[PDB]
Write a protein that binds this ligand. Structure first.
Ligand SMILES: O=C(Nc1ccc(Oc2ccccc2)cc1)c1cccnc1NCc1ccncc1
Length: 289
């Protein structure tokens, strides 16, 4: 991280061109605030992370990595940073107006239909299978992108996915780069973090999307036993809005042996086909009715 460089000439942004706003989050390090940036791109709304020695290098490493990784439609885009003397360290990214996916889906539980048929009006701004499968496809693409760069997210979960304009989802992170319900067995017991751990987490996110924002492991005390059972083979039951192939994808992601889990590249191709098959069917449903 400290080895990666920082082209200040390309990213540095003036602190007095930012009008801080309302808090979008809080942690033990500092916070993420919404704000107006003038001329970062005119005035645009953005999200700012700001601040201990250990935490400062962590925020700088996040900045350092986002620059190294580059741009991908499904990963929060970096717009700039305030690193030169005069004020606190701030990392600036695109503002995702609609919030975290979990909270969004919980809100659309009464606005869901598997697919639409005329009069398509009864379903104005409704969620469908096409939507749910698409959010999964996109998160998988962003993870393929991150995994290709040897990047381990470590906290993949619905609360860390944000909904943008025109159903575009973006992988993000409110913290500074225990959440047991998203942690793989080897991460809980061996404290190891791998791309394969992230694949497990992707499965839980999957469950969250097709349960429409429900919390994982419904009605279960997260304790020693919970963990012992995860290690012994116990898995969540299919969520209310899942399709058979999707639940089986969840199960492949939850494989006990990390090596036997699909890679994000396989998940992209697989999810991609399901979305294609769903599209096919919706066409026929729309046509017959
Ligand atoms: O998400 C942010 N940062 C981030 C993004 C991607 C990462 O991916 C990543 C890259 C390499 C390895 C591991 C993880 C790690 C860290 C971030 C940075 C600055 C300000 N806010 C936010 N998020 C909240 C937010 C964003 C938009 N609207 C509302 C709230």
């Amino acid at each position: 991280a400290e080895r990666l460089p920082y082209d200040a000439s390309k990213w540095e942004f003036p602190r007095d061109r930012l009008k801080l706003g309302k808090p979008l989050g809080r942690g033990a390090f500092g916070q993420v605030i919404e704000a107006d940036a003038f001329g970062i791109d005119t005035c645009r709304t953005v999200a700012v992370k700001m601040l201990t020695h250990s935490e400062h290098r962590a925020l700088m490493s996040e900045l350092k990595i986002l620059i190294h990784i580059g741009h991908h439609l499904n990963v929060v885009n970096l717009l700039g940073a305030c690193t030169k003397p005069g004020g606190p360290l701030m990392v600036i990214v695109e503002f995702c107006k609609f919030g975290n996916l979990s909270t969004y889906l919980r809100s659309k539980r009464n606005e869901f239909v598997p697919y639409k048929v005329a009069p398509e009006d009864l379903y104005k701004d409704f969620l469908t299978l096409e939507h749910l499968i698409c959010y999964s496809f996109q998160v998988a693409k962003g993870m393929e992108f991150l995994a290709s760069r040897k990047c381990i997210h470590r906290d993949l979960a619905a609360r860390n996915i944000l909904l943008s304009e025109k159903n575009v989802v973006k992988i993000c992170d409110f913290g500074l780069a225990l959440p047991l319900k998203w942690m793989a067995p080897e991460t809980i017991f061996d404290r190891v973090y791998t791309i394969q751990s992230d694949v497990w987490s992707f499965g839980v996110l999957l469950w969250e999307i097709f349960s429409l924002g429900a919390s994982p492991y419904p009605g279960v005390k997260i304790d020693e036993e919970f963990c012992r059972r995860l290690k012994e083979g116990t898995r969540m039951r299919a969520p209310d809005y899942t399709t058979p192939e999707m639940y089986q994808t969840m199960l492949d992601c939850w494989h006990g042996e990390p090596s036997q889990r699909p890679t994000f590249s396989e998940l992209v191709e697989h999810l991609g086909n399901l979305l294609q098959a769903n599209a096919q069917q919706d066409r026929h449903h729309h046509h017959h009715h």
